[PDB]
Design an enzyme around this catalytic site. Structure first.
Site, mmCIF file in Angstrom:
data_model
loop_
_atom_site.group_PDB
_atom_site.id
_atom_site.type_symbol
_atom_site.label_atom_id
_atom_site.label_comp_id
_atom_site.label_asym_id
_atom_site.label_seq_id
_atom_site.Cartn_x
_atom_site.Cartn_y
_atom_site.Cartn_z
ATOM 1 N N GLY A 232 45.791 40.509 40.678
ATOM 2 C CA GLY A 232 45.965 41.919 40.376
ATOM 3 C C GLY A 232 45.223 42.410 39.147
ATOM 4 O O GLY A 232 45.319 43.584 38.805
ATOM 5 N N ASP B 155 31.938 46.929 34.956
ATOM 6 C CA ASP B 155 32.995 47.787 34.433
ATOM 7 C C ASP B 155 32.509 48.855 33.460
ATOM 8 O O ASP B 155 32.916 48.868 32.297
ATOM 9 C CB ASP B 155 34.059 46.919 33.751
HETATM 10 C C1 LIG Z 1 34.537 37.229 37.008
HETATM 11 C C2 LIG Z 1 33.760 38.226 36.379
HETATM 12 C C3 LIG Z 1 34.349 39.058 35.396
HETATM 13 C C4 LIG Z 1 35.720 38.902 35.029
HETATM 14 C C5 LIG Z 1 36.340 39.802 33.976
HETATM 15 C C6 LIG Z 1 36.508 41.242 34.486
HETATM 16 C C7 LIG Z 1 37.679 41.425 35.475
HETATM 17 N N1 LIG Z 1 37.563 42.790 36.039
HETATM 18 C C8 LIG Z 1 36.914 43.044 37.267
HETATM 19 C C9 LIG Z 1 36.207 42.025 37.962
HETATM 20 C C10 LIG Z 1 35.562 42.283 39.171
HETATM 21 C C11 LIG Z 1 34.817 41.170 39.888
HETATM 22 C C12 LIG Z 1 33.422 41.242 40.143
HETATM 23 C C13 LIG Z 1 32.781 40.190 40.822
HETATM 24 N N2 LIG Z 1 33.452 39.080 41.251
HETATM 25 C C14 LIG Z 1 34.793 39.005 41.005
HETATM 26 C C15 LIG Z 1 35.504 40.020 40.334
HETATM 27 C C16 LIG Z 1 35.656 43.714 39.699
HETATM 28 C C17 LIG Z 1 35.023 44.193 40.978
HETATM 29 C C18 LIG Z 1 35.436 43.689 42.249
HETATM 30 C C19 LIG Z 1 34.826 44.114 43.458
HETATM 31 C C20 LIG Z 1 33.774 45.066 43.417
HETATM 32 C C21 LIG Z 1 33.137 45.502 44.620
HETATM 33 C C22 LIG Z 1 32.081 46.453 44.540
HETATM 34 C C23 LIG Z 1 31.659 46.974 43.281
HETATM 35 C C24 LIG Z 1 32.288 46.549 42.074
HETATM 36 C C25 LIG Z 1 33.350 45.590 42.128
HETATM 37 C C26 LIG Z 1 33.978 45.148 40.918
HETATM 38 N N3 LIG Z 1 36.375 44.604 38.921
HETATM 39 N N4 LIG Z 1 36.990 44.322 37.755
HETATM 40 C C27 LIG Z 1 37.664 43.880 35.030
HETATM 41 C C28 LIG Z 1 36.653 43.637 33.877
HETATM 42 N N5 LIG Z 1 36.653 42.229 33.392
HETATM 43 C C29 LIG Z 1 36.488 37.894 35.667
HETATM 44 C C30 LIG Z 1 35.901 37.062 36.650
#
Ligand SMILES: c1ccc(C[C@H]2CN(c3cc(-c4ccncc4)c(-c4ccc5ccccc5c4)nn3)CCN2)cc1
Length: 356
Positions: free
Chosen positions: A37, A172
């Site tokens: 989450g 982000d």
């Molecule tokens: C890995 C990298 C960074 C963190 C800290 C990270 C965790 N958070 C995240 C993370 C992700 C994410 C991106 C890629 N792979 C997994 C999760 C997304 C997210 C997920 C799906 C998406 C699909 C399309 C476009 C954008 C998207 C963005 N949003 N917030 C918030 C900021 N710090 C932790 C683990």
């Protein structure tokens, strides 16, 4: 002159994940919730069409208010524009709705990232080479972002994804707001923010991002937060101690009269010697840091200029540091109803063209 006059709708399958029903094209297999989450409603999956491990995010209540509907539209527009190796991009965007009337959910897709800069640093001791390469990628992506007249605004280690190959991507973007309460106290959410934006001294430009990179670079080099203020004022003091108190030039640039009064209330201090603050650091890195951590944002080094700094001699390639296509943000000053923001969003969703 050969054109497509229609689009073939994928077959969608639906399942219950993240206490919610996920409905996605069959190309996406083995969906498993990730981030606990924390990344939001994100499922890791395998894109069978591209043979890529991907991150699928389901926007929750994207149009529950005019504010949110516009944010949803803002995010989509941003993500659709980003096409750079060092910036989070869009692999796919979709909705199971056949019409605007039935439009409600929005699913976004990108490459699956393993960890952020924080996790990397916690797992091992980084070599100067690592730091060099890491900051290089940040500035390479910043040059691109800035060339489109976009400002991240919330650049910090948790917003930098890094892989096993020390490759990094910026994500982000801070395009919305950060509740002034989550910016209160001894919090990392504020330690990388430029002073002018942290205290609202003036209209911030893209150089606020350079200040952030400096904070990150310094910390990678020393292993210590550069300005771990316990609050806004304590943090400002930490900053002026290092870079010295504002001169008349900068003073006139601060619009708030109260802020100006406050600034002048502090005992004047000269800029510290970075060579003595960053003991043992590469003389080239120290020089660059001094160029980034300049109080008057107008004199801060630009990402483009930074890439050409001798410190990145081993990675710099003027023919391999791309800029972006124009980015129209006129909608930002536009006023529309929920449904109008929703329609603009739906239009962007169905018109998405996958990367070549
Ligand atoms: C890995 C990298 C960074 C963190 C800290 C990270 C965790 N958070 C995240 C993370 C992700 C994410 C991106 C890629 N792979 C997994 C999760 C997304 C997210 C997920 C799906 C998406 C699909 C399309 C476009 C954008 C998207 C963005 N949003 N917030 C918030 C900021 N710090 C932790 C683990």
């Amino acid at each position: 002159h050969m054109l497509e006059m229609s689009q073939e709708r994928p077959t969608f399958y639906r399942q219950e994940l993240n206490k919610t029903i996920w409905e996605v094209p069959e190309r996406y297999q083995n969906l498993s919730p990730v981030g606990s989450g924390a990344y939001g409603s994100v499922c890791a999956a395998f894109d069978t069409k591209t043979g890529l491990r991907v991150a699928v995010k389901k926007l929750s209540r994207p149009f529950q208010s005019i504010i949110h509907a516009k944010r949803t539209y803002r995010e989509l527009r941003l993500l659709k524009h980003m096409k750079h190796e060092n910036v989070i991009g869009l692999l796919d965007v979709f909705t199971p709705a056949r019409s605007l009337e039935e439009f409600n959910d929005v699913y976004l897709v990108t490459h699956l990232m393993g960890a952020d800069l924080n996790n990397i640093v916690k797992c091992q001791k980084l070599t100067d080479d690592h730091v060099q390469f890491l900051i290089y990628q940040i500035l390479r992506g910043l040059k691109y972002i800035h060339s489109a007249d976009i400002i991240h605004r919330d650049l910090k280690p948790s917003n930098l994804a890094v892989n096993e190959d020390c490759e990094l991507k910026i994500l982000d973007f801070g395009l919305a707001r950060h509740t002034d309460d989550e910016m209160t106290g001894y919090v990392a959410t504020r330690w990388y923010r430029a002073p002018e934006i942290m205290l609202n001294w003036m209209h911030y430009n893209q150089t606020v991002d350079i200040w952030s990179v400096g904070c990150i670079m310094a910390e990678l080099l020393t292993g210590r937060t550069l300005f771990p203020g316990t609050d806004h004022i304590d943090q400002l003091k930490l900053i002026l101690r290092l870079v010295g108190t504002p001169g008349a030039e900068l003073l006139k640039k601060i619009s708030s009269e109260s802020a100006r009064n406050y600034i002048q209330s502090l005992t004047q201090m000269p800029k510290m010697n970075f060579a003595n603050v960053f003991i043992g650091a590469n003389p080239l890195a120290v020089d660059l840091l001094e160029k980034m951590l300049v109080l008057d944002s107008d004199k801060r080094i630009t990402a483009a200029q930074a890439l050409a700094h001798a410190y990145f001699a081993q990675y710099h390639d003027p023919d391999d540091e791309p800029v972006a296509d124009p980015y129209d943000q006129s909608f930002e000053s536009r006023d529309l109803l929920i449904d109008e923001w929703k329609s603009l969003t739906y239009d962007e969703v169905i018109s998405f063209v996958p990367p070549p």
